[PDB]
Design a protein around this ligand. Structure first.
Ligand SMILES: *[C@@H]1O[C@H](CO)[C@@H](O[C@@H]2O[C@H](CO)[C@@H](O)[C@H](O)[C@H]2NC(C)=O)[C@H](O)[C@H]1NC(C)=O
Ligand SMILES: *[C@@H]1O[C@H](CO)[C@@H](O[C@@H]2O[C@H](CO)[C@@H](O)[C@H](O)[C@H]2NC(C)=O)[C@H](O)[C@H]1NC(C)=O
Ligand SMILES: *[C@@H]1O[C@H](CO)[C@@H](O[C@@H]2O[C@H](CO)[C@@H](O)[C@H](O)[C@H]2NC(C)=O)[C@H](O)[C@H]1NC(C)=O
Ligand SMILES: *[C@@H]1O[C@H](CO)[C@@H](O[C@@H]2O[C@H](CO)[C@@H](O)[C@H](O)[C@H]2NC(C)=O)[C@H](O)[C@H]1NC(C)=O
Ligand SMILES: *[C@@H]1O[C@H](CO)[C@@H](O[C@@H]2O[C@H](CO)[C@@H](O)[C@H](O)[C@H]2NC(C)=O)[C@H](O)[C@H]1NC(C)=O
Ligand SMILES: *[C@@H]1O[C@H](CO)[C@@H](O[C@@H]2O[C@H](CO)[C@@H](O)[C@H](O)[C@H]2NC(C)=O)[C@H](O)[C@H]1NC(C)=O
Ligand SMILES: *[C@@H]1O[C@H](CO)[C@@H](O[C@H]2O[C@H](CO)[C@@H](O)[C@H](O)[C@H]2NC(C)=O)[C@H](O)[C@H]1NC(C)=O
Ligand SMILES: *[C@@H]1O[C@H](CO)[C@@H](O[C@H]2O[C@H](CO)[C@@H](O)[C@H](O)[C@H]2NC(C)=O)[C@H](O)[C@H]1NC(C)=O
Ligand SMILES: *[C@H]1O[C@H](CO)[C@@H](O[C@@H]2O[C@H](CO)[C@@H](O)[C@H](O)[C@H]2NC(C)=O)[C@H](O)[C@H]1NC(C)=O
Ligand code: 565
Ligand code: 565
Ligand code: NAG
Ligand code: NAG
Ligand code: NAG
Ligand code: NAG
Ligand code: NAG
Lengths: 728, 728
């Protein structure tokens, strides 16, 4: 009786998870799409109205992929012809619709194949990138002003990031930043002239007779990196001059001496901007704070306002130096930095004083600063119950740091331990997003008195369905190794019986500053494996994992492929010693960094695992990109860390794979972890006479997320796992 | 008790067939390499002498890949630094050693990276190609004369073939032809300027940070083909002060009207050369016979000497128009052509006469003309016992065509039914090479009275080893289909018992004019499957197969992927009805064209096959090269045969694979059948949700022949077949 969570359930998404995505358009109103039409909600009372009826664009002749209302509510940007590129980048067509006179603007329209478009933060100015050059339109129906003329495909990028900056630094395609009231438009320019190209075939539809060769500037570890420059243009002067001047802001001398990166851009006030630069050896960063000089029309960054951030134990920041949050007057800012103990906490800075004051502290960390008002700073941390895998919203009194209120901890402690938040424009209201351990719960709250206004989405519908299925349970706990505690989670089959021996699958990622043991509720492949196949799926956060202090996170500095790999093997030993695991049936699998660790574990000769699956794995660090790799590994040169680069490859352990069953999978169009990486693993295995299973996914990328391939790969992996555990 | 022939025996070659490869140097002597030393043998008595010491180059410094003694015996070309290119092409370095003065020539030596080299047919002149240009050396130690100056990598080829001409037309890298006494040097010139390039990644050794992109001019079906020109140059009148003059021989107007190919070059006399041209629509070819004009210095090809060869049912020739065999005075010639019954026989032509006289006839075919004297013409045919899969040497009296004598049929009928032959210079002697059904047997014979002089190699050593192994047997027979007989062979497990049910694997190629059912003795994968796994391995020759007349061969004209696929299913259906076949365990596998047919069969929905394996298969004809594809399919244009091109793909049958187990294999560096072909197959399977097994071989080409890859692919396929058949 009562069905279980099956593979088909997962692949067909029969049990749908509901969410509540809103867009604040002011300090007390937000937009919500309720069945193809845009509604506007009054936060205060919960009442609404139709902002844009679903029939507004039926004869548009195109499927609108997304929309964007200008800050002043006067226009709406319609995106269509969406064509995905990398992780964040894509191109599209755009039309502007005048919401007042209800008409679609047909003159001086945004070009087709536009790479990026953004409204000014105030009013309705527009800035967009086309053919790698920046353009600005003061009015939707007027001609654009071209800002740059150097744009050149795969070579010069104005206003948009190149491959590595998009993926590893800004996690965005856009590289432009409007000043608060929209007067200035700041942007970065990347030059990839000497950056080597990764080349791979793209087969496309069957009708393409000759395969296409995709070529993208991609700097592998130790190769020539793109160089970068920063500029600011006064958009208010565009209609007064024929060719507005882009004033350059040069990097400090400490960065110019060698290769470096621009890693953060954050406006402070209408005439003050801050920039952080990072040396290619990512343990030294500098923040400049630059002011507009109204008499010279130039930007100057006083050395008395420069802030240095460096690390003696690792790289700076979790993945990059943190962003500052300036007070209204721009004279001070809050920033998350690692304290003397190695834990990331909020530090209060005066712009012209080098010593900051920490406003939080403890053996836990601040995840992020969410909002700042004249009286309070709101942040998310894992302080609650000392659970590094939990997240809660807190409020600290700027006039009395001992006054810290946890705003989400006790709301529903059993159902909610992992929160995310979304504040209105002036932080007058905030939407809380609970994502576990129970079903996601979305709520709205008033900042003036921190009172709950109402439940936005409680997922009652799904709760109703799941009651008729034997769902698995999840356990989150820790084990103590060398005096330090390390967390793990287990997806346990229904009616779990600890007096039995269950087969165990270790689900691993384990890249630096990652966390696989948390309180988030997920419906994924492990759900089906535990529920239907009675398999225990475990994950462990060992050395190198984040949110637990630098002692743990920086333990793998300059040594990827060691401690995080070993700790995974040790975790499996610990789990077997728990008594309910069948030592004859322990498997391991991972994707991406997880594919690498899995492969390293399978080739360790530990004898602990019977089989494993690596999906799109890194196989040798010299094949991965510079920014990410070098951050942890330094440079692959004899004078630096070449020996470890050469000693941490999967290929060097090929012989040991004779002891296990291995399934290797990779998408041929992977622009991130090149197919090359798995090509070298398979070749090494063939060379030592090792048999193994393999699967390539034609034209799929690092995500192997196309609908058909997603279903195909998880189906293939399920058969392999079931076979290895002989269920069947 | 007696081991079996195992997979390791196949992979490690424990049981080696001995050969006897001799090189005729005159009408009565030949060279044979024994114990690394080159000996010269007197054919008449069998006595020998050492020709060159295996130690002469003891300290040569390089590993000699091969040697080539000049016609006059005065010099020996040493080949080293061999680097393989495609199926026949490669580059290497060469040295010339003087046998008389026992000295290595050190002045004016052949360049490194030479693409082709060849002695003149007489004496010791040399002609070689380097950087795509032709050079001639009258003396080994003198400077060479540059014959061509237009050589350009991947664009202009002088004296060497481009990819398609190498693979599909000449089956050689060489595109130069010396006149009989070495006076003239004829050569072709290929222009691939507008030929599209196939591009694919080459990963190389682990140390290569960025994969390289290989690109080769390769015309896929319907694409722009390379153009060709033919030249003749007098090597007796070269000057070191003036650039050699090449005389062009243009193709006939019936050829110049559209795309065409040069398909054969054969010298008739010291001053007469014959050339055959073929239209891109390969059912029309023309032979020109050209004579040197001593007063003009030009070459004239009289129209009265033109010979047209066309086909109304298919293409011309087996794979191309056959080569002519001219008489001593070059006034007449013998050439194999399809007769009015559609059977290939020898026709006797007068150079200035249109009608030729057939000298052989019957429901069987001449395989090739092997030697010609004033009294007899020697040839190989499958006439004996009406077995299309057998081959014997015959001679026919030119003065009375009714006098035909079989020279090998009765030598040893039980052990020998498949012969190839090698005649000395003036056909005074001939070496017979029996290759089946028993162990290979090499013998020497004298033509005057067809005496069997002696046994050169009888493989008695191998015979002694095989008596201690349980070897499989081979059954060759036929089934009837619509009053027509089609042959098949079965490799039967040792101690075959017709009262038992054996699983069966259909080994298929089935390309046009192929033959898989024959009397040849082979030690291969099938030998192991039958001997050790007790699997019957069968092969069948259906419509489209060769050596049985055009009625059968041309049955698939303009329709590949139809009758040849259906006939394999029909054969399996019949075998499944036999008492000794387990109809629950019938599999099919093939490589290359056999990979295509295997895939087409598995996606047929016939229900006869449980599983199958396709290695480097063609999946849609538009992806394969023009010369081979168009020969059978015409052009992929709506006005020609595009519909069938689109209806004969593997991809369109994806859905029907849900009922079978399929293993798809392909080398990533396949320059012949591009990985693309399998990449589209897998994508189609993923798109309809059908699970399957796959394996790519990094950097392997169409042969997947490197030692490690070879062992790995056959090990992997063995596991697949055994699992499919439930064999321990
Ligand atoms: C939500 O409902 C309120 C209450 O009816 C609307 O409030 C408006 O408030 C102004 C000033 O207080 C009044 O003068 C208006 O008369 C009210 N609106 C109307 C239509 O009478 C508010 O407009 C509603 N908001 C949404 C998004 O529907
Ligand atoms: C991008 O960087 C390249 C250098 O990598 C710059 O190109 C050089 O430009 C100078 C002067 O124009 C030439 O003398 C050099 O020959 C160029 N070097 C190379 C390798 O091309 C280029 O100017 C930069 N582009 C921009 C817009 O800054
Ligand atoms: C606007 O100003 C920029 C910068 O002065 C101009 O860009 C220069 O263009 C010239 C050739 O026209 C080049 O020699 C320079 O190298 C360019 N400099 C930069 C920074 O790009 C641009 O051409 C001007 N646009 C117009 C319409 O005049
Ligand atoms: C946005 O901020 C800019 C910069 O402070 C404002 O522009 C300045 O306005 C003052 C007047 O208060 C002028 O004296 C300066 O010449 C302006 N400077 C520049 C660089 O333009 C601008 O007015 C603000 N925009 C809005 C809408 O308030
Ligand atoms: C190869 O054949 C050619 C052509 O038949 C011979 O060249 C001719 O030789 C005679 C002398 O006996 C000359 O008078 C002709 O002018 C030559 N013809 C040409 C085209 O050169 C040549 O002698 C023969 N070579 C050998 C080694 O026998
Ligand atoms: C050689 O083959 C071609 C193609 O099959 C024949 O040419 C014509 O082909 C088109 C279709 O491509 C048909 O519509 C015509 O009926 C075919 N015949 C003719 C005369 O056009 C061509 O006839 C063949 N040549 C010979 C000598 O058999
Ligand atoms: C094979 O044997 C013959 C003798 O039967 C050898 O001798 C003949 O050839 C020699 C040159 O090759 C001559 O010098 C002899 O005069 C000649 N003898 C006769 C009776 O004809 C011959 O050389 C031997 N061949 C080899 C390759 O060793
Ligand atoms: C090789 O073929 C090319 C192209 O067929 C010849 O060049 C011709 O084609 C060019 C376009 O690719 C035209 O722009 C040229 O006008 C045309 N003729 C010349 C002289 O370029 C090229 O000459 C051929 N090369 C040889 C050695 O025959
Ligand atoms: C072809 O290349 C080879 C390899 O460079 C040349 O051989 C010489 O090899 C020695 C070592 O064995 C080197 O020290 C020399 O530098 C090489 N070159 C020379 C000129 O000595 C060879 O000379 C080249 N030959 C031709 C015809 O190109
Ligand atoms: C999560 C992390 C982040 O928060 N900020 C910066 C960039 C986004 N982030 C990343 O880790 C990106 C990395 N390229 C992800 C990553 C790591 C790895 F080892 C691979 F093989 C492939 C891959 F895609
Ligand atoms: C045997 C045949 C011949 O005798 N003469 C001419 C060329 C050599 N010959 C060929 O068939 C060559 C073809 N490219 C072989 C061939 C056919 C096919 F369908 C493939 F997918 C791949 C392949 F390599
Ligand atoms: C909005 O459009 C949807 C179609 O997605 C339709 O079902 C619904 O009835 C519409 N609702 C309103 C209020 O127009
Ligand atoms: C975009 O492309 C379409 C079709 O190519 C064209 O009709 C339209 O006018 C283009 N719009 C712009 C702004 O270029
Ligand atoms: C930064 O890293 C390099 C490489 O390990 C190191 O030599 C240098 O001392 C580091 N700088 C600091 C401040 O730790
Ligand atoms: C031979 O022809 C080439 C090609 O044009 C030319 O460069 C060279 O100088 C010529 N040599 C003589 C001696 O005419
Ligand atoms: C004869 O047999 C062939 C196959 O051998 C089949 O395709 C055909 O339909 C049959 N009938 C005739 C009249 O050819």
């Amino acid at each position: 009786t009562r069905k279980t969570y099956t593979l088909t359930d997962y692949l067909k998404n029969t049990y749908r998870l509901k969410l509540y995505s809103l867009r604040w358009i002011s300090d007390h109103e937000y937009l919500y799409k309720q069945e193809n039409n845009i509604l506007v909600f009054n936060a205060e009372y919960g009442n609404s109205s139709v902002f844009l009826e679903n029939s507004t664009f039926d004869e548009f002749g195109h499927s609108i992929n997304d929309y964007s209302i200008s800050p002043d509510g006067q226009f709406i940007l319609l995106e269509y012809n969406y064509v995905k590129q990398w992780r964040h980048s894509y191109t599209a067509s755009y039309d502007i619709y005048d919401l007042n006179k209800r008409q679609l603007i047909t003159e001086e329209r945004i070009p087709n194949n536009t790479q990026w478009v953004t409204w000014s933060p105030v009013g309705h100015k527009l800035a967009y990138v086309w053919n790698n050059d920046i353009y600005v339109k003061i009015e939707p129906n007027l001609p654009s002003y071209r800002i740059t003329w150097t744009g050149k495909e795969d070579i010069i990028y104005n206003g948009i990031t190149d491959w590595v900056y998009e993926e590893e630094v800004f996690s965005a395609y856009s590289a432009l930043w409007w000043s608060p009231n929209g007067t200035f438009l700041a942007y970065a320019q990347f030059n990839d002239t000497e950056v080597p190209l990764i080349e791979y075939s793209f087969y496309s539809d069957e009708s393409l007779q000759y395969p296409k060769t995709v070529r993208v500037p991609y700097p592998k570890a130790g190769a020539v990196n793109p160089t970068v420059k920063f500029f600011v243009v006064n958009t208010d002067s565009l209609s007064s001059v024929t060719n507005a001047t882009s004033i350059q802001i040069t990097a400090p001398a400490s960065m110019l001496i060698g290769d470096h990166y621009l890693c953060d851009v954050t406006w402070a006030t209408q005439e003050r901007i801050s920039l952080q630069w990072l040396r290619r050896i990512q343990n030294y960063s500098v923040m400049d704070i630059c002011d507009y000089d109204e008499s010279s029309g130039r930007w100057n960054c006083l050395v008395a306002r420069q802030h240095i951030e460096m690390s003696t134990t690792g790289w700076v920041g979790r993945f990059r130096p943190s962003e500052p949050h300036f007070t209204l007057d721009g004279n001070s800012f809050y920033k998350i930095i690692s304290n003397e103990e190695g834990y990331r906490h909020i530090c209060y800075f005066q712009i012209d004083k080098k010593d900051c004051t920490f406003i939080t502290k403890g053996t836990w960390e601040v995840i992020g600063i969410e909002a700042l008002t004249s009286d309070y700073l709101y942040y998310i941390s894992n302080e609650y119950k000392g659970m590094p895998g939990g997240r809660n919203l807190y409020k600290i009194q700027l006039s009395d740091y001992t006054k810290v209120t946890c705003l989400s901890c006790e709301l529903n402690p059993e159902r909610c331990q992992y929160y995310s938040v979304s504040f209105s424009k002036e932080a007058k209201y905030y939407q809380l997003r609970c994502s576990g351990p129970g079903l996601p719960l979305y709520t709205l709250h008033s900042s003036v008195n921190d009172k709950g206004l109402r439940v936005l989405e409680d997922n009652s519908a799904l709760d109703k369905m799941l009651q008729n299925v034997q769902m698995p349970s999840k356990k989150l706990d820790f084990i103590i190794l060398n005096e330090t505690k390390f967390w793990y989670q287990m997806i346990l089959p229904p009616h779990f019986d600890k007096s039995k021996k269950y087969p165990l699958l270790l689900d691993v990622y384990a890249g630096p500053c990652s966390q696989k043991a948390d309180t988030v509720f997920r419906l994924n492949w492990a759900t089906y494996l535990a529920s239907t196949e009675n398999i225990i799926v475990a994950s462990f956060d060992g050395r190198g994992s984040g949110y637990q202090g630098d002692k743990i996170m920086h333990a793998i500095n300059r040594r990827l492929g060691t401690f995080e790999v070993e700790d995974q093997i040790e975790a499996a030993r610990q789990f077997s010693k728990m008594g309910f695991v069948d030592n004859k049936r322990i498997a391991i699998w991972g994707w991406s960094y997880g594919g690498y660790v899995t492969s390293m574990v399978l080739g360790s000769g530990s004898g602990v695992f019977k089989c494993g699956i690596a999906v799109a794995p890194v196989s040798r660090w010299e094949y991965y990109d510079s920014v990410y790799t070098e951050r942890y590994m330094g440079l692959p040169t004899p004078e630096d860390n070449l020996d470890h680069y050469r000693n941490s490859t999967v290929m060097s352990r090929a012989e040991n794979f004779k002891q296990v069953e291995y399934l290797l999978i990779h998408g041929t169009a992977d622009d991130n972890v090149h197919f090359q990486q798995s090509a070298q693993i398979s070749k090494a295995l063939v060379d030592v006479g090792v048999d193994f299973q393999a699967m390539w996914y034609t034209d799929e990328d690092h995500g192997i997320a196309s609908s058909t391939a997603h279903q195909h790969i998880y189906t293939h992996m399920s058969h392999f796992i079931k076979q290895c555990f002989s269920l069947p």
